[PDB]
Design a protein around this ligand. Structure first.
Ligand SMILES: [Ca+2]
Ligand SMILES: [Ca+2]
Ligand SMILES: [Ca+2]
Ligand SMILES: [Ca+2]
Ligand SMILES: [Ca+2]
Ligand SMILES: [Ca+2]
Lengths: 209, 209
């Protein structure tokens, strides 16, 4: 620390890492980049790969939402108990990222024509996470092992935005349904999810959800 | 160990992790899944996310190429010297993954219409890795720090396939050019890159490169 999130005025790819920081009792600063400021060019030109989020942690500057999640995961001890669990955490997070990419593609490039096919395919895309929960303490704790990991926050975000896209999509998945309610009720995370800094941002920048 | 790679008869998303295993003096089995066998449906249905590679390490079964890379990275000490370098390794690997997804999209979905624009955009996409090298001991060692990491193998693969797509694309990037030569000359990696198990596979499954 100190932590600074540099991003567009949306939840998007920073939602999960913000939930992680709030739930872990961390403070951070939000530095907002508007679409007009981004269009100007200076920050884009100065970013490593031409994209946001940028994240500052003391004198470390990071780019890439999943890099930030893994960093916070490693530094705050949210990375499983041993190397095998760490692999499982990664496997879950990579699967979340895969579906998030498909979600973003729908939202940004193909919402109207693609939503129907996307929602039809959704149960099959969500089932693996239910299966993973079923194989871990009957789905009663976390996605991997018995302590929260960075993957849980990313998975929780994915589930939350999918319930908005396709209300009731978790109804067929009792373990995923209970997991969302259960993680969301964690006192610091509950407060954050209720707070203006979360509630007053749109999920995505183009108005679609 | 023992290690088993389960994949299509292509280099694709297993090329980097195979280079890593070979360079680290590891043996592994290749179990080939044909397109005809894959279309039958049993392995697909049994896979966590409906995709290959599947990787077996003793009694651990993993999916997701970058999960496999990080697991091998963690277990073989190819993950930087401390937490900060580990974040930097992740940042590099996520950037490689981003460009690989763009590469795969071109190859699988849009090769003939998209190649011109892709190749015009390519120098801008490669420059960050040159910059990263420039900032690490003048580009003379590895992508992050003083020892090889899993991200090096993934970046090396990305560079090799791009030289096949766009011969001479590294000519403008002396640190990236020298880096490909230098890593490729590491004795165990050199041997592997010359071996029938590498040379006799196509880069991609659809004949394009
Ligand atoms: Ca912990
Ligand atoms: Ca319900
Ligand atoms: Ca129902
Ligand atoms: Ca090492
Ligand atoms: Ca040259
Ligand atoms: Ca030249």
């Amino acid at each position: 620390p100190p932590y600074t999130v540099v991003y567009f005025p949306v939840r998007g790819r920073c939602a999960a890492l913000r939930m992680l920081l709030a739930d872990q009792g961390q403070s951070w600063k939000e530095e907002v980049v508007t679409v007009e400021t981004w269009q100007e060019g200076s920050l884009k030109a100065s970013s490593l790969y031409g994209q946001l989020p940028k994240f500052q942690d003391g004198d470390l500057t990071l780019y890439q939402s999943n890099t930030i999640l893994r960093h916070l995961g490693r530094t705050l001890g949210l990375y499983g108990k041993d190397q095998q669990e760490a692999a499982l955490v990664d496997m879950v997070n990579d699967g979340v990222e895969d579906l998030r990419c498909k979600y973003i593609s729908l939202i940004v490039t193909n919402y109207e024509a693609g939503k129907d096919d996307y929602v039809k395919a959704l149960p099959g895309q969500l089932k693996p996470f239910e299966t993973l929960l079923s194989q871990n303490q009957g789905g009663k704790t976390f996605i991997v092992g018995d302590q929260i990991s960075f993957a849980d926050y990313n998975l929780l975000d994915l589930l939350l935005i999918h319930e908005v896209l396709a209300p009731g999509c978790l109804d067929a998945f009792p373990l995923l349904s209970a997991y969302v309610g259960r993680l969301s009720a964690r006192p610091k995370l509950k407060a954050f999810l209720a707070s203006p800094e979360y509630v007053n941002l749109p999920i995505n920048g183009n108005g679609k959800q």
